[PDB]
Amino acid sequence: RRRVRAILPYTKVPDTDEISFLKGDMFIVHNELEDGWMWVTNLRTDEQGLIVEDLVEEVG
Ligand SMILES: [Cl-]
């Protein structure tokens, strides 16, 4: 469980558990699979869903 920040914007694929986001959006990473899929909470929108880890950076 950690925070990550979007380094790019993203528009979700319709009728999926993906969420949209903007560059700079902060997320709580609840869980992550080996293939890069994360279940997160977007802290700006309070939406939960799927994101790919290559669109985010570790928060230090
Ligand atoms: Cl949708």
> For residues 18 and 49, what is the distance between their CA atoms, to the nearest angstrom?
5
Cα 57 to ligand 1 centroid, rounded to whole Å: 25
Resolution in Å equals: 2.2
Q: How many residues does the chain have?
A: 60
Q: Name the experimental technique.
A: X-ray
- Asked if 55 and 8 touch (Cβ cutoff 8 Å), the reply is yes
Domains and CATH numbers, the chain: 1-60 (2.30.30.40)
> For residues 57 and 3, what is the distance between their CA atoms, to the nearest angstrom?
9
Cα 23 to ligand 1 centroid, rounded to whole Å: 20
Which among 8, 57, 4 is positioned nearest to 31, based on CA atoms?
4
